[PDB]
Amino acid sequence: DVRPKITLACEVCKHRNYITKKNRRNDPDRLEIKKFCPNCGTHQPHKES
Amino acid sequence: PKAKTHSGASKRFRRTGTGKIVRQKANRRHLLEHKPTKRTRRLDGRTTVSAADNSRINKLLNG
Amino acid sequence: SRNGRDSAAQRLGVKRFGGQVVKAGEILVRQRGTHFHPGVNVGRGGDDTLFALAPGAVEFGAKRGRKTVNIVPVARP
RNA sequence: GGCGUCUGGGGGGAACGCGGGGAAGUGAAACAUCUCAGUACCCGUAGGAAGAGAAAACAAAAUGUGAUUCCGUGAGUAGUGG
RNA sequence: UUUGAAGAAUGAGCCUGCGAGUCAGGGACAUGUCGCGAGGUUAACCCGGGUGGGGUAGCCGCAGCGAAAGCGAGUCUGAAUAGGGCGUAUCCACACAAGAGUGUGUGGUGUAGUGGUGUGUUCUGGACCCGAAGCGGAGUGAUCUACCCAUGGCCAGGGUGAAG
RNA sequence: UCAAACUCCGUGAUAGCUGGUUCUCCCCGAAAUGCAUUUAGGUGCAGCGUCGCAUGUUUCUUGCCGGAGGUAGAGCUACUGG
RNA sequence: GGGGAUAAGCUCCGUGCGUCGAGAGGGAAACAGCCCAGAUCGCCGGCUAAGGCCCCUAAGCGUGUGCUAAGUGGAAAAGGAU
RNA sequence: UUGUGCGCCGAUAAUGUAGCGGGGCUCAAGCACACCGCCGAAGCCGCGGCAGCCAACGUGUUGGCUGGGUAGGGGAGCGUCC
RNA sequence: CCGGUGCUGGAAGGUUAAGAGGACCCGUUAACUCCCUUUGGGGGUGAAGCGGAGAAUUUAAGCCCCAGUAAACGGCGGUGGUA
RNA sequence: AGUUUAACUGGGGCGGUUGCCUCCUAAAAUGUAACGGAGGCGCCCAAAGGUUCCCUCAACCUGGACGGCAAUCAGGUGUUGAGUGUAAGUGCACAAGGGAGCUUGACUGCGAGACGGACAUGUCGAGCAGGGACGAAAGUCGGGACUAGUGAUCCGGCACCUCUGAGUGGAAGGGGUGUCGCUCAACGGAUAAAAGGUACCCCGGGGAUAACAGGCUGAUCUUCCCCAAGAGAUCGACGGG
């Protein structure tokens, strides 16, 4: 639709998932953002699932 | 006839060591995207039952 | 008629007045804009709420034309 | 099928038994799942009682109980439930 | 019953009788009272011609925290002695910390429940009493009336004048 | 007796509705508001009564002191509108 | 203060406002909501409040200084009026 | 002419005076301003009885306050039967 | 007037139940293979069997579809100009 | 055959409304009703978020090829009249308004103390630890100038966990943490699932509540009157009691 709910699984496995929204036509490609992952305890990149 | 206790109240309320009645806070099942983590943190855990509802919950639990 | 819609009252305003002693973290005013500006030992919140950063007594003053709220460190016994 | 001859049955009864069929008012502050309730009622059958009964059972590693029935607990608990 | 009715809101002709918060349950909560007291108490049942004696199975107190595994005066969350939540009867004294509200320890002090029964509420029962239109189950009715079936009866007198 | 007869039974059906509820005295003494409600004549919680316990004047009145307002009034080449 | 035609014995809000509700007694002719005043009981005692003092009707056809001619007193406007 | 205190028309519906409570009142019993008395309540005081709360001293006396009341809360009793 | 809804007739296609079908996957473990330590547990692969979920494919009426029918239920118009 | 078919309504019916945000009513704390008066919302932004640094508009005057009231350029005046994603309000020129560089804090574990509140919700928050962004540093950063952009519980889905696993080992199922699925918009959400007629009507209540009559008021009605513009004694407009 636009700004739907999207999930960022921790690239470093861990199944750490952040959620947020984005405009799926402003950014049709998958979102990539570097975020803190609790179990690893480090700032690893996160990829849209 | 022995009294029958309320099933839902038994599933929703607890008693602590000194007899305090303790419940869980609502608004924490779904729709947790737009909710900030501070809101979900203040909604986490258990609180004691308010004084207004104490008599009703005690009645629903004991019998 | 079109009318009939209104929002709830937000209970804004000043919570502690001049001379009242407060603890750190206590809310001083609830305002929309910066009608009062933070002074000494007074912080500003996300909704532009003023609160105390240290214990003491509320003092209302003006700084360069703006009404400000400050906390005075009352003397220890 | 007919004829003859012997032995049974038929119906009544207050409660209790067993096996079948099976409501609605009501409650859920409405109502259909659910409740009422396997109740009311009905059908078939007994006996002095009936039914059940002698493990294709429980149990949980105890070198454990040992047919059935009924009573008290377990327990308004484990659970189950628009 | 009402904001409000002396009544033009309600009910009552009169008298005498009768007529509405009761009972059950080791039910639940609170509060009296009695017994025992870190314990209290039995149920079914057994034996007594009784209201008495026995009966430990259970139940409630005696440790909590946690979803749970589990640990335990602690425990849960958490990477964390890093804060919070719940718990360690309560008070007192002494210290060491802080004046972000008081805390952390060392000694003492020592913690009260449970079983009868009274009372007030309460649960399940018709549950203070009275009062429908209606809903289900099983039966009874067509001697009234509606229609039909079988078999009988009745229709004074006077006109008109079809077919053939 | 008929927009679903009558009788008995379920049954003491159910009515947020209407009516009724019986001796005495002593002390205290309301409310007709807020929120929610398939809610508006009902109900839940709060507000206001009473009883018990705990706590003590913390309640209240008057004087003084420290505070924030945007009403009445007034004003407008201080703004916006007529 | 809003709504209504600032009309209603209309309606809806605010008020450490009052009274009635749940309040007797005195006054306003009568008169829940106005004024005075909060009834523990008795008295063939006294002083007062509101309101009154010619007679009904308790107490002054009270005193002093002025006004009114309209029974004004003892209901009402714009306006009119030697 | 100016302001003034009282007055006049405006004023005007259908049972019966009916817009002083009545009689009546200007020889005010009308109005204004001063003054003096008295009447007037279950208010206050006087004398006597009772009760609740509290205080003091005592082993129940005294004293101070209080005692309208619906819904309702608490306390103490009368009468009936077994 | 057969557009709507019924009714009657017809299936060339679309859709579609049960039943047949059981690919693929998953659980279990005979067997092995790696460890990692010492007074046997911790990882992987995994036949058959037994189970659990089950896909492609096949499949009728109905519906969609194609016609007819009003003495079937029903329906039967506006605007501007002009001698 | 069993049922459903909401509420508000100055009596009903048509209509409109039901949740959230902003102003007035609202009587200078807060709060305050009406089918009272005005508007908006059910989003948007990967930058319009974080940080560091820099800048200051609109309007007017003057001068400039098209070019004009009004495009872009220059000088001057200009303290807020511009603009702030979006209603309105309170703010913001110290900028929260305009520009650029790097970046993901649109974090994880928490949280003294508070505001608001019937309850359920809701709101602010210093500070501590981990691991980061920007910055020389001090420091700031737990989305956005602020206040709307939302939906409890139940039930189910997905990911992870050193939870559990009905004799045992597994597994199924259950549990925790994170999160997803409701114009449940009648927005505290009676069911997963629901429209009408009754003049054939019945029952129980209600003057809460109306119909006819009254009691009150007067938009309207009528009986008059006030000034006199006029026509010409009689009619009297325009206004007024």
mmCIF file with all atom_site columns, C-alpha atoms (C1' of nucleotides) in Angstrom, chain I residues 26-29, chain J residues 169-172:
data_model
loop_
_atom_site.group_PDB
_atom_site.id
_atom_site.type_symbol
_atom_site.label_atom_id
_atom_site.label_alt_id
_atom_site.label_comp_id
_atom_site.label_asym_id
_atom_site.label_entity_id
_atom_site.label_seq_id
_atom_site.pdbx_PDB_ins_code
_atom_site.Cartn_x
_atom_site.Cartn_y
_atom_site.Cartn_z
_atom_site.occupancy
_atom_site.B_iso_or_equiv
_atom_site.pdbx_formal_charge
_atom_site.auth_seq_id
_atom_site.auth_comp_id
_atom_site.auth_asym_id
_atom_site.auth_atom_id
_atom_site.pdbx_PDB_model_num
ATOM 1 C "C1'" . C I 1 26  ? 8.057  -34.201 8.135  1.00 0.00 ? 26  C I "C1'" 1
ATOM 2 C "C1'" . G I 1 27  ? 8.383  -37.571 12.920 1.00 0.00 ? 27  G I "C1'" 1
ATOM 3 C "C1'" . U I 1 28  ? 10.630 -42.153 14.660 1.00 0.00 ? 28  U I "C1'" 1
ATOM 4 C "C1'" . U I 1 29  ? 15.533 -45.557 14.019 1.00 0.00 ? 29  U I "C1'" 1
ATOM 5 C "C1'" . G J 2 169 ? 14.265 -41.128 24.347 1.00 0.00 ? 169 G J "C1'" 1
ATOM 6 C "C1'" . G J 2 170 ? 12.145 -38.165 20.922 1.00 0.00 ? 170 G J "C1'" 1
ATOM 7 C "C1'" . A J 2 171 ? 8.216  -35.774 18.601 1.00 0.00 ? 171 A J "C1'" 1
ATOM 8 C "C1'" . A J 2 172 ? 3.340  -33.467 18.594 1.00 0.00 ? 172 A J "C1'" 1
#
